[PDB]
């Protein structure tokens, strides 16, 4: 499962300390990333987020992102409802019954832009189609919400992709297997409700 050892170029050997190597590889380029402001005086730097070590911390610690964005619980046609300054979205399933609704969305945040090159439309509008777990706003999703909507495998992939994108946007190159090894430790426990 691990694959070839990047140092030797062949299949990893039994007894390899994969965890320490992964941790060191992740941490060595940490100083090359953008970092939150050091000025004690001024204003809080959380609002002026920068995609670096703060974002890596926000992902690894499995916290709720400050600029949280919603996701689609059930796939279906999306109806966008405008209001005075807020707006509401409702997804009606094409293979189901009741329709889910999100109403705390505000016009102050840009809507998720369809990234398809040929489509070119950008922001999703009324009458569009989305799948389960699709993001509906521009920002960062909630890992807990992703785990609730989908299986444990999906949330792990999402976390790996987010961390890898954060590290790659600044020129640091790290293989995905180290990120996967780090993430795997976050899904090793199951909470028991009743005995």
């Amino acid at each position: 499962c691990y694959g070839r050892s990047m140092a030797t170029g062949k299949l990893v050997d039994i007894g390899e300390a994969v965890g320490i190597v992964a941790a060191q590889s992740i941490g060595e380029p940490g100083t090359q990333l953008t970092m939150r402001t050091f000025h004690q005086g001024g204003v809080t730097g959380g609002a002026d987020i920068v995609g670096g070590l703060p974002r890596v911390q926000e992902l690894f610690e499995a916290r709720v992102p400050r600029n949280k964005a919603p996701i689609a619980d059930v796939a279906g046609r999306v109806r966008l409802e405008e209001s005075d300054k807020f707006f509401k979205i409702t997804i009606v399933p094409d293979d189901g019954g009741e329709e889910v609704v999100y109403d705390k969305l505000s016009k102050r945040q840009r809507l998720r832009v369809i990234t398809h090159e040929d489509g070119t439309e950008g922001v999703l509008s009324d009458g569009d189609h989305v799948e389960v777990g699709d993001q509906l706003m521009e920002g960062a999703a909630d890992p807990h919400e992703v785990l609730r909507v989908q299986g444990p495998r999906e949330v792990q992939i999402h976390l790996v992709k987010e961390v890898q994108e954060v590290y790659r946007a600044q020129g640091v190159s790290i293989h995905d297997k180290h990120i996967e090894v780090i993430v795997r430790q976050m899904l090793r426990r199951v909470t028991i409700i009743d005995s």
Binding site: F38, H39, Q40, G41
Partner: protein, 73 residues
């Protein structure tokens, strides 16, 4: 020579060596003519320790003052 004319910002009644990060060791626009803004130790005491400028003498009260040329008309 540099040691004798040194301006330390620590000691009895001063700031700690583990405090005042990037708030008191920054170059204020008032150093000009009273405290050299380029020459300072690179060790723990960066910014906290500096040197007096060439043209500067301490006011009897204890305020560093610098000379200037009067301009009229």
């Amino acid at each position: 020579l540099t040691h004798k004319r040194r301006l330390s910002a620590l000691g009895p009644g001063g700031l700690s060596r583990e405090r005042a990060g990037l708030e008191v060791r920054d170059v204020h626009p008032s150093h000009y003519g009273r405290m050299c803004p380029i020459e300072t130790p690179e060790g723990p005491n960066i910014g906290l320790i500096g040197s007096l400028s060439v043209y500067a003498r301490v006011n009897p009260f204890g305020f560093i003052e610098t000379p200037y040329r009067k301009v009229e008309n």
